[PDB]
Each structure stands twice: as structure tokens, then as C-alpha cells.
A paper describes a structure:
IPDO, a Rieske oxygenase (RO), catalyzes the initial and critical dihydroxylation of isophthalate, producing cis-3,4-diol isophthalate, thereby priming the molecule for further catabolism. Rieske oxygenases form a vast enzyme class—comprising over 70,000 members—known for their chemo-, regio-, and stereoselective oxidative transformations across diverse substrates.
To identify the residues involved in isophthalate recognition, we co-crystallized IPDOKF1 with its substrate and determined the structure of the isophthalate-bound complex to 3.3 Å resolution. Although the resolution was relatively low, the electron density near the mononuclear iron site clearly accommodated the isophthalate molecule, which was unambiguously modeled with a real space correlation coefficient of 0.98. The backbone conformation in the IPDOKF1-isophthalate complex structure closely resembles that of the substrate-free IPDOKF1 (RMSD 0.585 Å over 419 Cα atoms). The isophthalate molecule is oriented in the active site such that its C3 and C4 carbon atoms are located at 4.6 and 4.7 Å distances from the mononuclear iron, respectively, consistent with earlier reported distance between mononuclear iron of phthalate dioxygenase and phthalate. Interestingly, residues R234 and H257 participate in salt bridge interactions with the C1 and C3 carboxyl groups of isophthalate, positioned at 3.2 and 3.0 Å from R234 and H257, respectively. Additionally, the C1 carboxylate forms hydrogen bonds with the side chain hydroxyl of T175 and the main chain carbonyl of G172 at distances of 3.0 and 3.1 Å, respectively. These interactions indicate that the carboxylate groups are key for substrate anchoring within the active site. The active site architecture, particularly the positioning of polar residues, restricts isophthalate to a fixed orientation, preventing alternative binding modes.
Author numbering:
A (entry chain A), B (entry chain A), C (entry chain A): -10 to 424
Amino acid sequence: ENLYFQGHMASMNKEMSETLTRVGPNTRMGNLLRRYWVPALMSSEIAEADGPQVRVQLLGEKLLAFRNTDGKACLISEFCSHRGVSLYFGRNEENGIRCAYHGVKFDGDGQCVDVPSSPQSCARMHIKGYPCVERGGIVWTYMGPEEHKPSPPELEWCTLPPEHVFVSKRLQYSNWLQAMEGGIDTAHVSYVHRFEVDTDPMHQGVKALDYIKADGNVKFEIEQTPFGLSLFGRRNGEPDSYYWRITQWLFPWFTLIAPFGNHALGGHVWVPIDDHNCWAWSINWQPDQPLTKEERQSMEEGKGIHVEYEEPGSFIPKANRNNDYGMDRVAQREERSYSGIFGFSAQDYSLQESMGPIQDHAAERLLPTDKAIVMARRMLNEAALGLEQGETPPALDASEQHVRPAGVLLPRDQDPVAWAREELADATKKPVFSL
Amino acid sequence: ENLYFQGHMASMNKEMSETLTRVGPNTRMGNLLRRYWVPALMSSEIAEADGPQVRVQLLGEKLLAFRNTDGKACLISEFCSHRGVSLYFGRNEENGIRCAYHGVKFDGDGQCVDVPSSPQSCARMHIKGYPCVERGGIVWTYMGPEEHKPSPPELEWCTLPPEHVFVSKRLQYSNWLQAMEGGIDTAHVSYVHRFEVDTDPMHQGVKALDYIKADGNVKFEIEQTPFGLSLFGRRNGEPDSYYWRITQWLFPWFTLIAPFGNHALGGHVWVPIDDHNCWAWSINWQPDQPLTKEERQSMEEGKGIHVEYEEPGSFIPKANRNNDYGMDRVAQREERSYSGIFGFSAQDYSLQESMGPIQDHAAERLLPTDKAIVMARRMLNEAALGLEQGETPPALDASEQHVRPAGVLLPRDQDPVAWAREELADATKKPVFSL
Amino acid sequence: ENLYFQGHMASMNKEMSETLTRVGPNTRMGNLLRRYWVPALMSSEIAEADGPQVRVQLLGEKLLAFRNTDGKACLISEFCSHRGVSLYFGRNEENGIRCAYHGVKFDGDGQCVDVPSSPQSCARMHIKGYPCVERGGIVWTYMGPEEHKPSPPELEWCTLPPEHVFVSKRLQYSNWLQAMEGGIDTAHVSYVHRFEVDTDPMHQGVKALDYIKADGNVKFEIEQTPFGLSLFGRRNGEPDSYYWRITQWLFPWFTLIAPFGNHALGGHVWVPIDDHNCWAWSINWQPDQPLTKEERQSMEEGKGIHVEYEEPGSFIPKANRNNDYGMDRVAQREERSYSGIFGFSAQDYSLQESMGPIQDHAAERLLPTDKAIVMARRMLNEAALGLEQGETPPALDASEQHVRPAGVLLPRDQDPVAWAREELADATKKPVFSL
Ligand SMILES: O=C(O)c1cccc(C(=O)O)c1
Ligand SMILES: O=C(O)c1cccc(C(=O)O)c1
Ligand SMILES: O=C(O)c1cccc(C(=O)O)c1
Ligand code: FES
Ligand code: FES
Ligand code: FES
Ligand SMILES: [Fe+2]
Ligand SMILES: [Fe+2]
Ligand SMILES: [Fe+2]
């Protein structure tokens, strides 16, 4: 798809829309996204060895996640080869999962340890077992061909001490793309999060807010990096200066969000369960120090990008489709909430959810504010279509994801792009740039 | 479809069935029904200016209903042009709805007041905003081409003082047609409402009941009026006389039901939400006087054609799919209810619901009692197929809907058709004809 | 499909999979299974004459079951000919069901007793009424062409005194085939029922258990009988002897399970509601004596093959999709349950359910233990495809179903097949062979 149609940016065509949103096994985006380490499951889920196997579907592939006797977090297919029973009901023990029907056993790597019936027939029963690692507090799995297994991701929050990072998933009933797009559209922070930024503990009392809750019209400068796209979201800061909100889009699914002051750094990744559902991952980290108990609780409590859940055990958020996201029309009128939904993530996924599981890319009237998005789109669309032609994809090299976002006031003189070549090299080993 | 097959009346063919039941945007029935003012939403819903916008889907078009700051009940599409978020979460204020994501604002007429990003790009964002009026206590919207906007409907209950009319909607999980057909089939009143007519306050203690709960075999005389069809439902009244139940079918969806005695006048309209769902509207009015507090409460209480709802806020009736319509097999046996369902509307929609969202027009064995229906069918089918050929449709002129139904005892001598040319001219400005 | 592919048994092809699993009106399996008496409904459901008609869908045919005034359990179609209303809401009285809309009445045989509108038009309204009988405590209906109506089934539990038999249905959310396959795969009894056999009252404290909870690798000998297939499931019993578990598969859907000791005899039949749902029927009978109150309660209580239900009235089991079958991961670890599900049927249908409503016959890696299944498969597939060619099907003659299962210890010398020609003739009129 061309970058600009009729002077306005270009809506996605049919073919393109599906290139991107269809993420099933053996589809364009499917094959592309599989080449990257996939954030499967929190380690806190299978914390115990020989513990409850947990059903996780990633990229339209129903899978099962367990910690082998040895302490190895594994990911196998959920369905036994023998008669397609769920291995959920198998036995996680002796470094494998033995299915409950006729005793067939699966390695973490998904090999058939033991077939009671015909031991000769072990090699036929081999199921889909995919390798894993333990960065982030997240179990990362690799689903792309064995040979093109890349280096585990080295985002700052992957690498920093655990006490420095906080991670949550939230189940969101929409395709990954849209949900991600909300991370790469700072303009929305002006409107839908207008009042919430004052109230929330991760966004509050920072001079940036003044600038945000003012010039909503974000002019975007996109720089293509080998880690994805640098998004310089310009917003009239001071009469002499612009408040650039520099959000790093780490291809293909992780945002590193611009800081809000000294307050903890924030970030996301979007893991598509299928074509209509995604895992919305939020990470807060703090480079210099660890997370205060006060910070941690508040993140735990569902403040910030994190979200309170309906019941323990459920990654479905307390505010959801059913709940009307606790639409408080009082508060709408009382200018305590634009959307009428409180909570940061709730505000965001509510709108994302409302679009439908897949928005009508057809009827999208894209605007300026949508540069980030369009650029990321093409970037994805190229990669996938490219990978179709055997073109190795972008940002596989995890050393390059050694980066941080930024929020600086720059005189309208300084090209921000330049500024980040200068100021933002080795950016993890520097201070953070806030406000 | 021919009027009679094999001597019996004619079942609908495939093509015809869908002409009629498919009501989506840009389908035969869709285009036809759009030419008429559509009863969207009760005014009592958006009673307040700048109040909660209420999600209403009409004719398979998800729409949103609000009262602009000015007091103008509007109907806009539910989805923002920018990224297809629900405007539900927008802001009803300053004579528009400003979507919560990137601040785009919509006029009541559905124009883009303000696009923050690119003010130049306002005219691209124009969404579907459709005109409205305030008859009936119902917000009526016009969805057909701008030019073919007709005169607001002038049914007696539209025009009489509000204190004279009572209006309710009930959410019914079935296509509009069948649901409507129940209004144009007086024969059923004999069987399924047999005992309920004694118990209910709008039908009780009137000599008509004797006649109804006797000769269920209704012979129908249909007269085509320019307002739709006059249905003379003959039923052996007295040995010398017939009890004609004259139900006016006001094309395309409103029944004016024959009176039951001095008791309030009754009526319906069926607004199809989609191909499988409809809004079942019941109106009781009283021409000469206003509705007694005793009448009003009892109508409010869910007696008569009205229906008690599951919870406040919900237009889903208390008796529903789930509830088994409170099947009381005791009462069935105790001859307190034919169907086993109590309540008038409940009795009716239960059966209508049971057919399936769309009945199997294929396997319909139509009978005599089905004249009304078949005639109304063809009338519809012609109009739509006609409108396909650019043939302006029937009953657009709302002066002609200045009519009332009737229930008279006529010697078997008098042709009832004649009787209504004589007796039923200027019928609104007359007495009502009951029993 | 060939019996063996690549030395391993043969997975079902596409065409075959659907031959078997598609059971709708007028499909291969549909037509085949219709030729046999179908266990519709327990008599205990319509125990009363003129009682509540009960909605039952069999073989993808929504039907209605009532006991005519006379005491004749009937099965009619659920939908009225007039306008396709549910006859559920009709009146069971005067040896018929009179539909509630316009008073049309249906015979048990599904003839139109009385059409009020046009009495002439009675013969057009004839609906699907199918004959019935009262064996088992189950209402059996015949749905195949009138002429090919066979003899009511004469399984031992059909014929023995009622106090000798116990019957339950359990609603299982999966196609019939898989669910049935679990009856014809004794190998699973080793693994998934390992610990439950000790605990349960119908399986406990019998020397057979030792043998079962030992050699799970069942070698199968299948003998084709005219009643279906005799399945000699061999399992290393004693060093000198094999524990043959002889399960009779009575074509097309009834297992007679091998005994567990003196304990009551057990059996199943699978009635497909549609392509994705089935009625799982469990029968326990006792040939020599009637069922002890202690046996009966315990069967009633949901022990054995029977199952406790969520609420009274519901044939949905207490442990279900929602409940996670009360996965007790404690118990899994505590070796009180392999699967983690307690209860015999629960253990079984859980796994069956987990496969999906239809398992992925494509990805089935069949093993030795799957002889029974494969043989039964072909047998079915032949019959149906055969019936397609007008080839009258197997096991219609109910005298031949005068048979019982068996569990004998046979020296590894004795061919078990031979043994049953000798020992198992007139087997109903003999002792039972246990352990
Ligand atoms: O793009 C941003 O400015 C921003 C701010 C706060 C949260 C998020 C998010 O992606 O959740 C983005
Ligand atoms: O056609 C009729 O006689 C009748 C009577 C009562 C109610 C209704 C209805 O349309 O709801 C119709
Ligand atoms: O095949 C068997 O051994 C067996 C044992 C217990 C129950 C069942 C069943 O079909 O439910 C089968
Ligand atoms: S289905 Fe897993 S052991 Fe057979
Ligand atoms: S989606 Fe409505 S403001 Fe952008
Ligand atoms: S639908 Fe049954 S009486 Fe008409
Ligand atoms: Fe947001
Ligand atoms: Fe009715
Ligand atoms: Fe079993």
C-alpha cells in the first residue's frame, strides 16, 4: 500500500489488513511473528517444577506450558498425538507430560519419551514442543523454524534485576495490531487519559502533563532504527520549545513508552492469541534503582498501565465488555474522565475493544496523528510479505534493542532526530530523559 | 410468488423469504423500510440534553442516539471515522459527540464539527447522522435518501396528547416479520390468549371475549388502503351476526389492533434490529380522554401488550428464552393458560421466539387464518422489489394514517368492507367501535 | 480406508471421518443409525400421561416426547406445520399435542387430528411422528423408513426386570463416536481410571484390578459377530495366564463392558444429538438378582459410570467444561487421580470433551490399543456407505444381542476366541465371567 493517498495517509487495503491481522499458523504475519521470541506466560504461573500445566494459546496455536521436574519452563502443544486429548489432563512429572488416556508421554521439547502401547512408534507421536527462556519474569518461547532461532530479547526490562521490573498481562478481546497501535499514538494520551494522568501514581505531578493536556495535535517524526522505529511525537511544549515524546517501537510488538518524569519507565508488548484476541503485556521498570514497595503495590493494585482483574486467577480485567468498563457518566460530565471509563489501561482497551475484534480498516480515516501507526504498519507488512520471499526480517539482533525512550524539551530549532543520534547513544547506560 | 398454490395459500419461496426478512443496509427490504420514519428510541431514554448517548441498532445499522446540548434528539453512527472506536465513549456536549480517542467531534447531523489533528480534513470524517422527530414519545429517525424523507407519521397515537398514549419497547429475539405477523393474525387470540383475556385489565369483561373464545376460525376480508391493508377478521359473533375484528395494518410495521370494549386502544410497530432480532413496540392510547392512573400503572406494570422486564434498565422481558417464559404446566392443565405461558406479549413472543430467529418459510403450511399475513407479505414483497425498480413505495403520506381500528357486530348481510367506507370515514374524529 | 497404513493402524481420511461423524438427517451415518431403535428419552421423564412434553433432539432432528392420554409414549417433531412454532407450547391432551398458536393438533404418530381453520387441509399438516417402545426404562424410537422398522432391542438390560437394571443419561458436549470409542478402549482403564477403580463401589476390591493397574498394554483380538464385534482385550494377567477383558460392541452404539467381579454388570449406548453433541447412556444391570438398595443409591448418587449432575432437572454433569471437571492438582500429585479429575465418567468425558466436539481424525496417531476402535470404525463406515448402496445393515436382528461380556483368566495357550464359542454360547442363561 502507498504511504499517502489523496494527501491524507493511506488506509489499509483488504489484502494488507489481513497480511497484518491474520496471525494463524502458516500465514504472512503468522510466519513473520513466529521468528521472534514470543512472551508466552509469566514464570509466576508455572513457578513450581512438576507444577500445574497452564493452557496458553499463542499466534492461534493452542499450547501448554509447564516446568519440567528439572526446573525447565517448556511449551508443548496442548493435544496428544494418540487421540487428540488435551495434555492439560496429562501428568507433569519425570521431565515430561504423560497424557491421561493411554499413557503416552511428552518431553518438554515435545518428543515422545514413552509410548506404552508400541515403544517402536515413539517418533510418530512427536508433538510441537518449542524452546523457552526466562527473561523479564516472562517465559519466552521460540516458534519459528529451528534454524532461525534468534538471541533472547535484550530490552532493558528483560536484563535489569527482577526487583527493577514489573510485568503484567491483561486479556484483551481484540486483535494485537489495534491494541499495539494505542501504544504508538501519543495523541490519545491528551484526550482519553487527560484527567487520569493527574490521578494515577505513575503519571502524576510532572511538568510534561501540562504540555500533554494542551497540545493534543502531535506532529510525528519517525526514524527507522534496526530495532524498529523511533517515534518523535512532537507536541507544543513551551512557546520556545517542543515537548518531544520519544516512544521506541521495538519491532514487532513492544513499546517503550516515553517517561513521565522521575516516575518508573513504562512499556508494552502485544502477543496475539488469535486473529480476534491478544495478550496485552505491561512492563514498568526503573533503571538506576529497584521498584519501591510503594511503586510495586500500586502497580500490583492495577494502577498505571497495569489493570485490576475481575477475580483472582483471571487475566480478564475487572472493567470489561460486560461491566461497561464501569462507565461513569457522572464522571464524564464532572470532567474526571473523557471516555467515562476510569483507569489507564481500561480507558485504552475499552476503545480498542469497542472497534470490534478487528477494526474496519476499510473505513479508517487516518490522520496526521497516525504517522507512527502507518509507518509501523508498512514496516510490518513489508517484513511479512518479505519473509514470504525468503527475506530475513528486521530487529532479530537483540543487542540493538539496548534502548530507552525519552521525553525532552527541544527548542523548535533542534531537529529531534539529530538530538537522539547525539544524546541517546548507549541510552541504557545514561540517565533517562524526562519532561 | 403467486397468491394461491394448490388451493391453499402460498408459502414464501426462498428469494421472497429473504426479500422480506433480510433488512441489512442496501437490501431489498432494507432499502424499502428505510424510506419510512423508523421508531429508534424512546425519548424517555435520552430525556436529558447532553445526556448519556444510548446505543441503538436499527435495520442492521449500529447507531447512537443523543440529545444535543440544544435539546435535539439526534442519531449518529456509533463508530468514529478516525479509527472506528465507538462514539459511545465520546462526549455528548457542545451540540455534538466528541470521540474519546483523538478528539474528533460529530454533529447531530453527523458532520465533523472539529478534527483536532487536520482541521482541513473535516469533510472526510463525516459519519452517518440521520434526522429525527419527537412523535409518540418515540424518537423517529429517517434513514432513506435525503430527498425521499417523508412527513413524520400521523397515527392517532403519534398525534394525541402524551397523557393519552402509552409506549413500550420489548426486545424480541426474532426477525421483525414473524413478530408482526402475530399482530395480523386475530385467530391466535382465540387459542393462545384464550384465558388471559379474562384476567388482563385491557381485555377483560367485554362481550367480544365470548365471541373470540368461541369461533377461532377467522375468515378474513382484506381491503387494500393507501395506508396499508384493512383486515376484516370475521368470527361467528351471534347466530344473526358476525363479530368483525378490524385490524388496520399500517404499512410497513404498525398494527392498530381491534378494540376490546371501552378499554384503551392498542397497537404495535416492529423495528428490526437485524435479520434475527427486532424491537417489539406496544402503544396503548385513548382518543376521547387521557389514560387513567389505574390504566397507566397497569400498562407500566407489564400487563396488556406491555411486558415486565428482567431487570431495570433492560428491555429484555422478565419471561424470556432462559426463563422458559415461566412455563406453568400446572396452569396449562388447570386451563389458566393454553401455551403454559402467562402474560399477553409473553404468550405471543414465546411462540414467535420458538420458531427460530427466522421461521422455516419453506415448511410453512399456511391456512385460511393467514390471509392477513399473505396479503401483507405480497404487499411488502411488491413494494421492496418495486423500490428496486425505482417504484416509489406505499403509505408514505402520513395524512392517510389518520385511522382507527374497529370491532363491530354486523348482520351476516352487511358486507363489512362497505360498512367501513360508510362508518369508518374520518374515523379518528368519531367514536371507537367496540364489541 | 485400508486397515493398516505404514504398519501402524490407519487414521481416518476426511471423507471417512465425516461418513461417521456427520449424523444429520439424510447423511450416510444419519441414514444408517436411523435404521436402529434410538434411545430417545427415559420413561421417567414423561412418566405421566398427558404430562409435560420434553424436548429431545436425536440425530440432528429436534423432536418432542410425550405420553398420550392413553399412556403411549410418542415422539413427534417439535415444530408445528402451520407457522413453525414449537409444539413444546402445544397442549398434550386428548391423545395429541394441540399447538398453541392457531389450534392445530398432532397425533402421537404425528398426524393432524384437528386443523380448526381448514379441516380439509389435515393431511398437509402431517408432521414427523416416529414409533416408540418401552424397553430399558428408556423410550426407544424408530426413525428409519417405515418398512425397515426392526424388532425392539433385546440386550440383557432391555429384557431383565426393571429392578434389575439402572439407566442414566449424561449430556456430553462431543460427537457420539469419540465418546463411544472410550467404551471400546480398555487400555484407558489402566491409566485414567487407575486409582478410581479402588475407590468406586462398582469396580472396587476385585482381583481384576491388580491386572489392570499393571499391564496397560492391551493386545486386542476382535471377532466379528452378527451383533457387532467381540473385543478380547488381552492384558498380562498372571505369568501363566492372560486377563481377557471381553467387551461386546453391540452395533452401532452400545457397549457391554467387561464385568468387575461379582459387582453389577455395566454398559453404555451413545445417541448423537447432533454432529457436536451426544447423549451418553450408562446402564448397570444384575442378571441373577435385582439391584441392592445400596447398589441403587450409589448408582443414583453418580458413582460408577453414572454421574452427579449440576442441578436437579439438568442432565449436564456437575463436573463439566466450566467447572474444570474439578481438576484437583493436589490429587494428581497425591496419586489419587491420573487426569486430576475424579469420578469415572467425569474422568472419561473430560478427555473426550477436551479433544474438541470433533477430534482431529487427521492428526490421530492410532496405536495397537486402537484395534477395537478401528475395527468398529470400518464396521460402521462399511455399513453406512453400504446402506448408501441399498445394502441392508448389520445387527438389526435383536435376538442375536442376547449376549453378555466377560472377564476370564486364560492360559496363554487358550485362544480366547475359541473359548467364547465354547463357554459364551447362550451367555445370558449362564453365569457371568468375572476376574
Ligand atoms: O504513547 C504514549 O504516550 C503512552 C502513554 C501512556 C501509556 C501508553 C501505552 O502504550 O499504554 C502510551
Ligand atoms: O389481532 C388481534 O386481535 C390482537 C389482539 C391482541 C393483541 C394483538 C397484538 O398484535 O399484540 C393482536
Ligand atoms: O472398556 C472398559 O474396560 C471399561 C471400563 C469401565 C467403563 C467403561 C465405559 O465404557 O464407560 C469401559
Ligand atoms: S490421547 Fe494421549 S495417551 Fe492416548
Ligand atoms: S477514533 Fe474517534 S477520535 Fe480517533
Ligand atoms: S403454528 Fe401451530 S397452530 Fe399454527
Ligand atoms: Fe492509551
Ligand atoms: Fe398474540
Ligand atoms: Fe473410561
